[PDB]
Structures are given as structure tokens and as C-alpha cells.
Design a protein around this ligand. Structure first.
Ligand SMILES: N=C(N)Nc1ccc(N[C@H]2C[C@@H](NC(=N)N)[C@H](Oc3ccc(NC(=N)N)cc3)C[C@@H]2Oc2ccc(NC(=N)N)cc2)cc1
Ligand SMILES: N=C(N)Nc1ccc(N[C@H]2C[C@@H](NC(=N)N)[C@H](Oc3ccc(NC(=N)N)cc3)C[C@@H]2Oc2ccc(NC(=N)N)cc2)cc1
Ligand SMILES: [Ca+2]
Ligand SMILES: [Ca+2]
Ligand SMILES: [Ca+2]
Ligand SMILES: [Cl-]
Ligand code: NA
Ligand code: NA
Ligand code: NA
Ligand code: NA
Length: 473
């Protein structure tokens, strides 16, 4: 009985529906009756063309603001180079109108869509905070495709107001269920960037998304890191198809690209999922993504099976989002227990790094205490170290269940002598593992240079619960 959209470019949206099995299985969710009705998504970007013929029908002024000019109207600034086209492209990915003879369709083509104009101007900590904290009892899902420079030498994350906005969002947002922050993992592939050096995507509060090409490969622009949760399709080489969406000046484009296109698609899938269960918390949503995402047909040289039997890659996280499976699992989902936080100060003395440093530590993960964790979610190694050339370092963390997470890969362009100042390297790869036992931190000099430095602090921070495990996969 379900009739798929008749829009003129819907057949070119290969990532939504295909015979191939090389899609996000979104039609299966639509057929179950989930199209995004009642869900509100906001694009945090350079503005949104609210009068676009494929966005006007779903546009929501309540999900919108202009932080750059301080007014409610997020209309893009028009220029000859069409610089401010990105928010409009992203909005169409989430929620372009269906069955209206214009362009293609959104993943959640019945959701409401807004945008925050905040990239077109000086982007301070305050600007970020006011955008992340926009109408958090009206907006359900935020999508952001921006972050620290992808030059492969930057280490940067949210400053105080922005970090406060994240904690207020997940704590009190959406009636206490928590704002859903969907984030693009980065486009610094060409610069050999490592996305744990981006504090926005590396955050536990953001649901971070990477890209795969049409033929199932790691795109040129992709950044690998342990903080990434999952993947959606985006662009690749010039024989591979691209993203079809709404463009500036009321146009339709078939050439939207990069990881910045992957986050909105994920945000759309998350909107469908929220429609299927409005009671899902921000942590519930990340559990659903971990359990339902699909590695199959994604090519990577680093696929590994973790302690509970799930395949995970630093390029793809747990794999391709599966909309049909997300909405199915959401319906009878039992809310996870309150989040526990176990803090373990590892070092008894500073340690010289030299050519290689290995730190072994057996932990009880707060045994006997209210923060006792037997089911891991995120894990962080918060490190403070000095080093003469930061990009020569590679850092790995091994869980008691034997799962080796790359916290930091060599970054050839990172010549900084500034080291890391309590930087919270995060991994999702040990999700649902029991964290009791021996953890191993490995720091190594990947270059032939006589480098030098000292690790002065290593805090292992474990998040999770002590109840509700599934039989391993
Ligand atoms: N890439 C896009 N899609 N848009 C876009 C276009 C241009 C930019 N350029 C950035 C450059 C950027 N430069 C630096 N941060 N160093 C600039 O930041 C400022 C600006 C002013 C001040 N001082 C002050 N007294 N106000 C301090 C820092 C914002 C400055 O941002 C703008 C943006 C637009 C405008 N003009 C306008 N809105 N009519 C002015 C500055 C950034 C983004
Ligand atoms: N330092 C210099 N000499 N120049 C310089 C270098 C970088 C910036 N930051 C700007 C750069 C700016 N890029 C350009 N003007 N080319 C970037 O523009 C974007 C990015 C993404 C999208 N949307 C999308 N879907 N792709 C749209 C416009 C915003 C991007 O804005 C920010 C601002 C803050 C942050 N946060 C942070 N760094 N902690 C992230 C991005 C500004 C000035
Ligand atoms: Ca405005
Ligand atoms: Ca349409
Ligand atoms: Ca990056
Ligand atoms: Cl915390
Ligand atoms: Na809460
Ligand atoms: Na994240
Ligand atoms: Na153990
Ligand atoms: Na061991």
C-alpha cells in the first residue's frame, strides 16, 4: 500500500532507495509509516533558504534563528559565489518535501526543518553556545557539519559556553530526554587528519557520523578515529554518484559532497527513529545506532571484532545506518539505566615517552560503588603530555576484552610542540564491554627522529551502566 515518492529526482537518490542493497534502507522505514511527522530538526550552518520550493512546506520558524545578525530570520546572505548555500543543501537532505514535483525528497520528508544562521560571521564560543542551545524544548535534533580546521595540525574543541550548551542540552533539553546532536566527523582526509583531535565530534554528547562512497569505499576526505559511531553514504570519485538535494536560489543540485552531507542524512534517520519512539533519550539513540548499524559491503583495512562480537572500524564506526532496523528496534525499546561515570586516575608518577611508552593498569571500574560499570558506553583516556613534535605520536588504548582503539594516528602536518592538555580522547569501540580488568595505553614515536616528552596525567573515564546486557553478537 505504501507508495514511494514520485519527485523527479527521487530516482537519482541512490542512497535512499535501491535494488542494490547499497542504500540506507529508508524506504523500509517509510513503509512502516515513519516519515518524520512531529519531529523537529535544525541545521546549524550558514543559513536556510526558507522559501525554497522544496523546503517551504516543512519549514519551521521555531527551529530557526540568525545568530550572526541577531534576528529570527535565517535567510542566507546572497553573494555571487553562492558561498552561503550549505545550510540549504543540508536542510533538503533531512526534510525536502515529497510528492510535490520538485527535486528529490528528504529522509524525513514529513519532519519540520529549520536552520540557524551562525557560520556567516565571526564564530565565537558565545555564537556556538547560542546555536546549540536554541529552543531546546522545541527542536529535537541538531545537525552540524562544521568544526575546527581540517588542516591536520589543529587540536581544538568546544570552549566553556559551548561545552555548557552540550551539557544543558543532553540534561534538560527535550523535556529532560536530552537534545540529539548529530555531527559530521570531518573532511580532513587529504591532510591525514585524525578526528579525535576535533573536540566537537570527539564528544560523547554528539552522535558522530562518517562517510562511505557509492562503491563502498573510504572516501578521500574521510578522517579515521575511535569516536565515530556510524556511517552514511556521501560522495567519492567522479564515477560514483553524489547527494541530490535543495540548493541556493531555489535550485536542485545533484552534487552535494563530503562528510558534511553525511550528518544531515543521519539526522533524518534519527528523526524517523524518534517518530517511532518519542521517549528515546540521547543515550538510547546512540545505543540504537550501535546495535543496528551494518558493516556489510563497506571496505576497510581495519575492521575488528570487539568484546561483544560487533564489527567496528575507525573509518566507519559500527557501519552503515539502517533506517528500517532503527525504527523497528526503537518501538519496543526499554530506556537505558541512568548514566554512571567511573573516574580512574592511572599514573602514580610521570612517565618519559621516548620511543615508546606502554602503561598497563588493572581496574575494578568502581566495584562496590554507585558508579560501578559492567556495561561500557563511551570510554575516555584524558591525557596530559608534553612532546616536541605532536604529529609524530600514535596512541592506542586496549580494553580488558582485547579491543584495540586508535586514540590518535600520526599526523604528518602536526609539528606543534604544545602537546596535549587533559585532552579527552574518546572511543566508542568498546561499547557494551565489561571494563573491569587490564587496560593498556600505548604511546609511540612513529618517526625516526629522536623525539622527547613526558606523560604527566592519564585519567581513564568510563561511562555506562551495570544492567541490561544482550547476548554477544
Ligand atoms: N564561508 C561562508 N559561507 N561565509 C563566510 C564569509 C566570510 C567569512 N569571513 C570571516 C573572517 C573572520 N576572520 C577572523 N576570525 N580572523 C571574521 O572574524 C572576525 C570579524 C570581525 C572582527 N572584529 C569586529 N570588530 N567585528 C573579529 C573577527 C568573520 C568573517 O565572517 C564574516 C562573514 C560575513 C560578513 N559580512 C556580512 N555578513 N555582510 C562579515 C564577516 C566567514 C564566513
Ligand atoms: N584563521 C584564519 N586565518 N582563517 C579562518 C579559518 C577558519 C575559519 N573558520 C570558518 C571557516 C569557514 N570556511 C570558509 N570561509 N571557507 C567555514 O565555512 C563553512 C563551513 C561549513 C559549512 N557548512 C557545510 N555544510 N559544509 C558552511 C560554511 C566556517 C568556519 O567557522 C568555524 C568557526 C568556529 C569553529 N569552532 C572552533 N574552531 N572551535 C568551527 C568553524 C575562520 C577563519
Ligand atoms: Ca537574518
Ligand atoms: Ca520534492
Ligand atoms: Ca578534522
Ligand atoms: Cl560528565
Ligand atoms: Na535529564
Ligand atoms: Na561524538
Ligand atoms: Na575483565
Ligand atoms: Na592481558
Amino acid at each position: 500500500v505504501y507508495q514511494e515518492p514520485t519527485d523527479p529526482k527521487f530516482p537519482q537518490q541512490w542512497y535512499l532507495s535501491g535494488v542494490t542493497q547499497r542504500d540506507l534502507n529508508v524506504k523500509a522505514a517509510w513503509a512502516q509509516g515513519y516519515t518524520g511527522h512531529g519531529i523537529v530538526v535544525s541545521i546549524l550552518d550558514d543559513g536556510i533558504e526558507k522559501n525554497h520550493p522544496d523546503l517551504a512546506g516543512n519549514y519551521d520558524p521555531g527551529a530557526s534563528f540568525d545568530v550572526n545578525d541577531q534576528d529570527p530570520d535565517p535567510q542566507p546572505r546572497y553573494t555571487q559565489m553562492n558561498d552561503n548555500r550549505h545550510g540549504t543543501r543540508c536542510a533538503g537532505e533531512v526534510a525536502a518535501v515529497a510528492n510535490n514535483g520538485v527535486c528529490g525528497v528528504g529522509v524525513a520528508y514529513n519532519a519540520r526543518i529549520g536552520g540557524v544562521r551562525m557560520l556567516d560571521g565571526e564564530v565565537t564560543d558565545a555564537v556556538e553556545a547560542r546555536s546549540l542551545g536554541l529552543n531546546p524544548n522545541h527542536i529535537h535534533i541538531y545537525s552540524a557539519s562544521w568544526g575546527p580546521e581540517d588542516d591536520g595540525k589543529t587540536v581544538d574543541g568546544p570552549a566553556r559556553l559551548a561545552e555548557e550548551a552540550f551539557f544543558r542540552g543532553v540534561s534538560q533539553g527535550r523535556g529532560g530526554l536530552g537534545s540529539i546532536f548529530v555531527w559530521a566527523s570531518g573532511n580532513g582526509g587529504r591532510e591525514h587528519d585524525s578526528c579525535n583531535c576535533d573536540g566537537y565530534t570527539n564528544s560523547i554528547y554528539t552522535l558522530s557520523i562518517s562517510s562511505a562512497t557509492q562503491f563502498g569505499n573510504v572516501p578521500w576526505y574521510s578522517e579515521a578515529c575511535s569516536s565515530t559511531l556510524a556511517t552514511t553514504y556521501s560522495s567519492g570519485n567522479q564515477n560514483e554518484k553524489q547527494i541530490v538535494t535543495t540548493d541556493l536560489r531555489q535550485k536542485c543540485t545533484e552534487s552535494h559532497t563530503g562528510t558534511s552531507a553525511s550528518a544531515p542524512l543521519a539526522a533524518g534517520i534519527i528523526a524517523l527513529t524518534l517518530e517511532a519512539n518519542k521517549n528515546l533519550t540521547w543515550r538510547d539513540m546512540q545505543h540504537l545506532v550501535v546495535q543496528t548499524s551494518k558493516p556489510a559491503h563497506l571496505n576497510a583495512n581495519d575492521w575488528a571484532t570487539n568484546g561483544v562480537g560487533r564489527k567496528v572500524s575507525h573509518s566507519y564506526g559500527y557501519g552503515l545506518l539502517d533506517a528500517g532496523a532503527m525504527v523497528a528496534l526503537a518501538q519496543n525499546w526499554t530506556t537505558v539505566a541512568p548514566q554512571r561515570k567511573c573516574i580512574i586516575d592511572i599514573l602514580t608518577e610521570p612517565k618519559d615517552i621516548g620511543k615508546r611508552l606502554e602503561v598497563r593498569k588493572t581496574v575494578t571500574a568502581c566495584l562496590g560503588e554507585p558508579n560501578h560499570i559492567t556495561r561500557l558506553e563511551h570510554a575516555q583516556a584524558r591525557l596530559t603530555l608534553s612532546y616536541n613534535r605532536r604529529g609524530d605520536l600514535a596512541i592506542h588504548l586496549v580494553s580488558p576484552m582485547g579491543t584495540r582503539s586508535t586514540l590518535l594516528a600520526a599526523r604528518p602536518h602536526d609539528y606543534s610542540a604544545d602537546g596535549f592538555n587533559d585532552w579527552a580522547f574518546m572511543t566508542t569501540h568498546s561499547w557494551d564491554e565489561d571494563p573491569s580488568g587490564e587496560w593498556v595505553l600505548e604511546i609511540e614515536n612513529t618517526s625516526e627522529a629522536n623525539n622527547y616528552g613526558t606523560l604527566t596525567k592519564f585519567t581513564l573515564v568510563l561511562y555506562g551502566t551495570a544492567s541490561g546486557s544482550l547476548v554477544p553478537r
